[PDB]
RNA sequence: CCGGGCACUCUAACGGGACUGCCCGCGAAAGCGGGAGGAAGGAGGGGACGACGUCUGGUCAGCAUGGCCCUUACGGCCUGGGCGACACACGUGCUACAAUGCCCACUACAAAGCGAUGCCACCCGGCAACGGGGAGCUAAUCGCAAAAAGGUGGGCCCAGUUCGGAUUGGGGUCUGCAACCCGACCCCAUGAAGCCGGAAUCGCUAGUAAUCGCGGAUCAGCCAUGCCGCGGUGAAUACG
Ligand SMILES: [Mg+2]
Ligand SMILES: [Mg+2]
Ligand SMILES: [Mg+2]
Ligand SMILES: [Mg+2]
Ligand SMILES: [Mg+2]
Ligand SMILES: [Mg+2]
Ligand SMILES: [Mg+2]
Ligand SMILES: [Mg+2]
Ligand SMILES: [Mg+2]
Ligand SMILES: [Mg+2]
Ligand SMILES: [Mg+2]
Ligand SMILES: [Mg+2]
Ligand SMILES: [Mg+2]
Ligand SMILES: [Mg+2]
Ligand SMILES: [Mg+2]
Ligand SMILES: [Mg+2]
Ligand SMILES: [Mg+2]
Ligand SMILES: [Mg+2]
Ligand SMILES: [Mg+2]
Ligand SMILES: [Mg+2]
Ligand SMILES: [Mg+2]
Ligand SMILES: [Mg+2]
C-alpha cells in the first residue's frame with residue numbers, strides 16, 4: 001500500500017510524513033521510509049507597473065513538494081488506525097496500492 | 098580491489114572506478130577513442146594518470162552523464178584524480194600544485210529580464 | 225463599455241470561438257492567467273498580501 | 285484554403301436566394317453581407333450587392349470568377365494616392 | 368580599469384607540444400567557440416609545414432612569431448590643436464599579442480581556397496623574411512621611426 | 522538550343538545543369554534522372570547521344586517549360602487582373618499580393634526608395 | 640540558410656517536418 | 663528485464679564548512695602585501711532587496727476615486743468593415759552576402775519545463791504537411807523529445823554559385839460557424855536585392871562576449887524573427 005502526500009509548504013508536509021512513519025511502527029509492517037520526490041516548480045513573471053514599463057519585472061513561484069510512504073505488510077490493525085490522523089489542512093494525501 | 102572517484106563539472110557527472118590492469122579504459126561501455134572520437138582535448142582527462150607514473154598500470158571504468166563532451170572530459174579528469182588520491186594519501190603531492198583535485202565551479206550565468214542574455218544589453222540609442 | 229463587456233464575456237456565445245477569458249477581479253481582458261483566473265496586476269497585488277497559497281517571491 | 289474533405293462553404297441564406305430565384309423569375313438584385321460566401325456556378329448571371337462595410341457594391345458574376353469569394357470583388361479601402 | 372591592474376589569463380599548454388604559444392595561436396584562429404575546428408586547422412597547417420620545409424613545425428612557428436614581433440608602435444594623442452603619433456615601446460606580452468593577431472589576419476588575407484594551407488603558407492612565409500604580417504610590422508616600425516621628434520610627448 | 526531550347530552549362534553535373542531550365546528545379550532535376558537511367562554524377566560534356574536525346578524527349582514530354590510556362594503564368598495574372606479580383610487590383614499597382622505589410626518594407630514589389638519632403 | 644524551407648536547417652528553424660526533415 | 667543492494671550518481675530536508683581563521687612582513691590602529699592548508703581566500707560567483715527626496719515624470723484605458731459632462735444617447739445589441747492603408751522618414755530585430763562554408767547520409771552528448779474539450783507511443787496510407795486505428799500516462803512511471811553546434815564519410819570548386827530565399831503562379835493539409843480584406847504549415851515551379859555596408863553609432867571584463875539548439879506564459883489556430891527562462895561549445899583584451 002502506497003501513500004503519496006503533497007503540499008505547498010515543505011515543513012508541514014515533512015511533519016505529516018514523519019507522523020505517518022512513526023505511527024506506522026505501532027504495529028510494525030516493515031515500514032518504508034518517507035522518500036522525497038522532485039519538487040515541481042511553476043513560475044510566473046509579471047510587469048511590475050500597471051502601464052508601459054516592460055523592462056521591470058517581478059518573478060513569483062509556486063512549488064509542490066511530494067513525499068512517498070510505503071508499508072510492506074498490510075497491518076490491518078495499523079491500517080484502520082490510519083483513518084483518523086492529525087493531518088494539516090495544507091497537506092493533500094492519496095492512498096493507493 | 099576497486100578505487101572510486103566522483104567528478105563533477107558543468108552539469109556533467111562522472112563515476113570512475115580503478116582496478117589493476119593492463120591499462121584498458123572504458124567510458125559508458127565503449128572505448129575512450131570511440132566515445133570522444135575526433136576530440137583533440139580528450140587526452141587531457143588522463144593528465145593525472147601521467148603526473149603519477151601509473152598511466153598504463155590502471156584499468157579504468159567510467160560512467161558519465163549530463164553536460165557535454167568537454168564537461169564530461171573534465172569531470173573524468175577530476176574523478177580520476179580523486180580516485181588516485183584515494184589510492185594513497187601520498188598522491189596529493191604532484192596533483193595539488195597542478196590543481197587536479199579542485200572543483201571548477203564556473204557555471205552558466207542565468208538570464209536576467211531587460212537583457213537579451215546574462216549580460217548582453219539591448220542596443221541603445223539616445224533619440 | 226466596461227460592465228456590459230464583463231457580463232457579455234460571462235455569457236455563453238453562439239460559437240465556441242467567441243468565448244474569451246477575463247480577469248475575475250477587475251475585468252481585464254489582457255494578460256489573464258489560466259491557473260488563477262486573474263490578470264498580472266491583480267496577481268501581483270494578491271501575491272504581495274499573502275492571499276495566494278504557496279505563491280512566493282522567486283529568486284535563484 | 286478550406287479542406288476538400290469539407291464542402292465549399294455558402295451561408296445558406298444567399299444560396300436560398302439564388303435557388304428560389306432560379307425557379308421563380310430568375311433575375312433580380314440581391315443585397316448580401318456574406319462576403320465569405322463562395323460563388324457557385326448557379327450564381328452566374330446574377331447581380332449581387334455585396335457589403336464593403338459601408339455600401340453594397342453591385343457585382344455581376346461570370347464564369348471565370350466562380351471559385352472566388354464575393355468579398356474579393358468589393359474593395360474595402362479607398363486609396364487613390366499620396367498627394 | 369581605474370582601480371588596479373588586470374590579471375593576465377594563464378592559458379593551458381596544448382596537449383601535443385605542451386606549448387602555451389600554440390594555445391594562444393589556436394585561440395586567435397578560433398571564432399564562435401569552434402575550438403576543435405581551429406585546432407584541426409592548426410594541425411593540418413603543421414602537417415603541411417612538415418611536408419615542405421621539412422624542419423620542426425614548432426621551430427618554424429616560433430621563428431614566424433619572433434619575426435612578426437614589433438618593438439615600436441605609435442599611439443595617437445591630441446595636444447593643443449593637433450594630433451600626434453607618439454612612438455612608444457611595446458611590452459613583451461603586447462608583442463606576442465600583436466604578432467599572433469597580425470599572423471592570423473595576414474593568413475586570412477591570402478587567396479588560397481582552404482584555411483589550413485593559408486595558415487601554413489603564411490607561417491613559412493614569415494619564417495624567413497616575407498609575408499603580410501612582416502610587412503605590417505615593418506610599416507608600424509617605420510611609422511614609429513618617422514615620429515622620433517615627438518618622443519617627448521608621452 | 523539543347524534541351525527545351527536552352528543550353529545547360531557544361532563542366533557541371535547533369536542534375537545541377539538541368540536546374541538552369543525555366544520550370545525545372547532540383548526535385549524535377551532528380552525525377553528526370555531517376556526515370557531515364559542516367560547517373561547524376563556525370564558531367565554534361567560527357568554524355569552519350571542516346572542519353573541526351575532520351576533525356577530531352579522525356580523532359581519535353583513530361584513538364585510544361587520555358588515560354589509555354591511563362592505564357593501560362595502571364596495568362597493567369599491577366600485573368601486575375603481583368604475580373605477585378607483583389608489580387609488583380611494589387612497586381613495592377615505592383616503591390617504585395619499575399620497580404621504583407623506596406624507601411625515599411627515591400628521593396629521587392631515597389632522598387633527603389635522615392636524619398637519625398639517631410 | 641535558415642530562411643530556406645527546403646532544407647533540414649530551415650525546417651529546424653521553423654520547427655516543422657516534411658520531406659526535407661523527416662521524422 | 664528480474665531477483666537483490668542503497669555501494670555510487672541522483673532526488674529533498676536537516677547540518678557542517680570560510681571566519682584575515684593561521685605563519686612572515688608592513689603599520690598606532692583599521693587594515694595592505696606574501697604563503698600554507700582547503701572544493702572554496704579575502705564580499706567565494708549570481709539573485710531578492712532601492713534611503714530623505716527629485717522629476718507639475720507615467721497611468722482617470724487594469725482597478726479605485728473628487729469634480730464636470732450625456733441620459734428613446736456620448737448608454738446597450740447585431741452584421742460587415744477598420745486597428746493589417748502606403749509617394750516616404752526613424753527605432754528594435756531576423757536572415758545573409760559564403761570554403762573556419764553549403765548540401766546529403768549515418769552516428770553521439772544536456773538542462774529546465776509542460777501535459778485530462780490534454781500529451782500522444784507504436785502500426786497503416788500520402789513525397790509531405792497530415793489523416794485512420796490505437797497503447798501508456800491524472801504522470802522521477804507514459805509522452806512532448808528531435809537536441810543542434812559536434813564526430814565520420816561523400817558531393818559542390820570561387821561562380822550571384824549546390825551562396826542567398828524575397829516576390830509571384832499552381833496544387834494541398836489543419837484550426838476555426840467562417841482563412842477575401844486578414845492565419846499557420848507541406849509539395850511543385852519561380853530564384854529578387856545582397857560581394858561585408860557614408861557621416862556615424864551599440865554591447866560586452868569569464869563560463870562573460872560570440873555562437874548552437876531546447877522549453878514555457880498568452881493561446882481553437884497563429885502572423886513569436888518578440889518576451890521570460892535553460893543548457894552545449896567557448897575566446898580576446900585592460901598598458902593606463
Ligand atoms: Mg547560453
Ligand atoms: Mg460606445
Ligand atoms: Mg480564444
Ligand atoms: Mg483573455
Ligand atoms: Mg570596475
Ligand atoms: Mg530551373
Ligand atoms: Mg545512503
Ligand atoms: Mg505632466
Ligand atoms: Mg500624457
Ligand atoms: Mg476611471
Ligand atoms: Mg475620474
Ligand atoms: Mg497595431
Ligand atoms: Mg496589409
Ligand atoms: Mg525601440
Ligand atoms: Mg535594423
Ligand atoms: Mg528572418
Ligand atoms: Mg543558388
Ligand atoms: Mg541555398
Ligand atoms: Mg484571414
Ligand atoms: Mg544586383
Ligand atoms: Mg562572390
Ligand atoms: Mg545613431
Ligand SMILES: [Mg+2]
Pocket residue numbers: none
Ligand atoms: Mg565591470
Ligand SMILES: [Mg+2]
Pocket residue numbers: 755756887
Ligand atoms: Mg524581428
Ligand SMILES: [Zn+2]
Pocket residue numbers: 247248249250251252262263264265266267724
Ligand atoms: Zn485584474
